[PDB]
Antibody
C-alpha cells in the first residue's frame, strides 16, 4: 500500500522543459516532507530538492536553482518537479522520496534534523540530448573461421546508429533463445547508439538452417529482420 | 567533491564482516543524524539505517551503524551474495543548506572464482562497406571479476580515435560481458594489413585479429 509511482520522464533537447509527477498512496501525503533525488547513468545519488508538508519551505542544489521548481498538490496526493532549461548533466533517473517522519525539527533557516528518506519510488528516466530520433542500420556479423571454435560458430547482427533507447532483439521470431548474447548499447560521440547481438550455433547446422535477427525500434517505427549467413566471393 | 567521503569500493568473503566509512564535518555529521541507503543493481535505493544506528522493519541485524564525532560507519556481519550493492551515507549539511550524499561504495562479495574473457572479433560487413561505413566489433564475455581494459592496434601501432568501449555488465550466469567498437572509413580499413582487439583482464591479455583481404 505504501508506495510512490512516478511519471513524466522522457527524451528532450537542451534548453527544453519537462514535468515529472510522483503520485503517493498508503499514507497521509500532506503530512510528510518530500524529496527529489537523481542518479546519472552509472553515477552516484545527487540530491535535487526538498519540499515541506505544506509547500511553504523549499531547498535545492545550486545546480538547479532558477531552473527547477519543486511543488505539490495535497488534495491530489502528487509531488511535482518542473524542470526548465534542461542541460546535458540533467540526464538521469529521478527518484521521489519521503521523510521517515511527518514532523520536522528546525532551529533556523540552516538547521533541520535529518530523519532519513524512508519511502522511495521506482524512478523515471530523463534523457537530455541534441540527437534526433533515428532508426538503426542492421548489418550481418557473418560466421567464419575466425568466429568458429570446437564445432560452434558465432554469428550476429550489428545494430548501428539509432536514437533513442531502447532496442529489442530476438532470433528466428523468438524460436532461438539458447546461446543468445545481446550486449548492452554503447553511446557514441555523435549521440547515436550501437549494440550487437550474437548467437552461438553448431557449425554443422549452418547449411540446414537460416538464422534471422529481429531488430525492433519503436521510437522510429523500425522493424527489421536480417538474414545472417557466410560471405562468399 | 562530495562533502561526505566514502570509500569508492570494498570487498570480502561470504561469512566475513566489512565496514564502510563515511567522514564529514561539524556542519553535517558532527551536528546531525546520518542515514545509510542500500541500492541493489537495477533497483531504487532502500533505507538501511536511520539516526546513526537504528534499523527499520525488514532489515536484518547483520547491518549495524556506528558514530564517532565527524565519522560514521556501516558494519555488515555474515556477508551474503545478495548484499552486493552500492551503499550511500546521507545527512543534512547546515553550511550548504542542502541534503547531502556520499560518493557511494561498491560492495563486491568474493563469491566466484577468477574467469578469463572469451573474445570474438568481427570485421566490417560488405553491406556496411557498401554504405561507406566500417565498424569492427569486439565482443567480450564470461569474465570475472567485472573489469577489463581494451586496446586496439593497426599494423602494430595503437589507435585511440574511433574506439567506443562499454562498461562491464552482469550476465545471467553472474560473470560479466562487455563490447568495444572501432569506427573507421572504408579507405583506412583497406589501407592497413590487419587490425587487432586486445582485451586485458587481471594483467593477462587475449588478442584477436581481422584483415581486409580475409573472407
Amino acid at each position: 500500500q505504501v508506495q510512490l509511482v512516478e511519471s513524466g520522464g522522457g527524451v528532450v533537447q537542451p534548453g527544453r522543459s519537462l514535468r515529472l509527477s510522483c503520485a503517493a498512496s498508503g499514507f497521509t501525503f500532506s503530512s510528510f516532507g518530500m524529496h527529489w533525488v537523481r542518479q546519472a547513468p552509472g553515477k552516484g545519488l545527487e540530491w535535487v530538492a526538498v519540499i515541506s508538508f505544506d509547500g511553504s519551505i523549499k531547498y535545492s542544489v545550486d545546480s538547479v536553482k532558477g531552473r527547477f521548481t519543486i511543488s505539490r498538490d495535497n488534495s491530489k496526493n502528487t509531488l511535482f518537479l518542473q524542470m526548465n532549461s534542461l542541460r546535458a548533466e540533467d540526464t538521469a533517473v529521478y527518484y521521489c522520496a519521503r521523510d521517515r517522519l511527518n514532523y520536522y525539527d528546525s532551529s533556523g533557516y540552516y538547521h533541520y534534523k535529518y530523519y532519513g528518506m524512508a519511502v522511495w519510488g521506482q524512478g523515471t528516466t530523463v534523457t537530455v540530448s541534441s540527437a534526433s530520433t533515428k532508426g538503426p542500420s542492421v548489418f550481418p556479423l557473418a560466421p567464419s573461421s575466425k568466429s568458429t571454435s570446437g564445432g560452434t560458430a558465432a554469428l550476429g547482427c550489428l545494430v548501428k546508429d539509432y536514437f533513442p533507447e531502447p532496442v529489442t532483439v530476438s532470433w528466428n521470431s523468438g524460436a532461438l533463445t539458447s546461446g543468445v548474447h545481446t550486449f548492452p548499447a554503447v553511446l557514441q560521440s555523435s549521440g547515436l547508439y550501437s549494440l550487437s547481438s550474437v548467437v552461438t550455433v553448431p557449425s554443422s547446422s549452418l547449411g540446414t538452417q537460416t538464422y534471422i535477427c529481429n531488430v525492433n525500434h519503436k521510437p522510429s517505427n523500425t522493424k527489421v529482420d536480417k538474414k545472417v549467413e557466410p560471405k562468399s566471393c | 567533491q562530495s562533502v561526505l567521503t566514502q570509500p569508492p569500493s570494498v570487498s570480502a568473503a561470504p561469512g566475513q564482516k566489512v565496514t564502510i566509512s563515511c567522514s564529514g564535518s561539524s556542519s553535517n555529521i558532527g551536528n546531525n543524524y546520518v542515514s545509510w541507503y542500500q541500492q541493489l543493481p537495477g533497483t531504487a535505493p532502500k533505507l538501511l539505517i536511520y539516526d546513526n544506528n537504528k534499523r527499520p522493519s525488514g532489515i536484518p541485524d547483520r547491518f549495524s551503524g556506528s558514530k564517532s564525532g565527524t565519522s560514521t560507519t556501516l558494519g555488515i556481519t555474515g556477508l551474503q551474495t545478495g548484499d552486493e550493492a552500492d551503499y550511500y551515507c546521507g545527512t543534512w549539511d547546515s553550511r550548504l543548506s542542502a541534503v547531502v550524499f556520499g560518493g557511494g561504495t561498491k560492495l563486491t562479495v568474493l563469491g566466484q572464482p577468477k574467469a578469463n574473457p572469451t573474445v570474438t572479433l568481427f570485421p566490417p560487413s560488405s553491406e556496411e562497406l557498401q554504405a561507406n561505413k566500417a565498424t569492427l566489433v569486439c565482443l567480450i564475455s564470461d569474465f570475472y571479476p567485472g573489469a577489463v581494459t581494451v586496446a586496439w592496434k593497426a599494423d602494430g601501432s595503437p589507435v585511440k580515435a574511433g574506439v567506443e568501449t562499454t562498461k562491464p555488465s552482469k550476465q545471467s550466469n553472474n560473470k560479466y560481458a562487455a563490447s568495444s567498437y572501432l569506427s573507421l572509413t572504408p579507405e583506412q580499413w583497406k589501407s592497413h594489413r590487419s587490425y587487432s582487439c586486445q582485451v586485458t583482464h587481471e594483467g593477462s591479455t587475449v588478442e584477436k585479429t581481422v584483415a581486409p583481404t580475409e573472407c
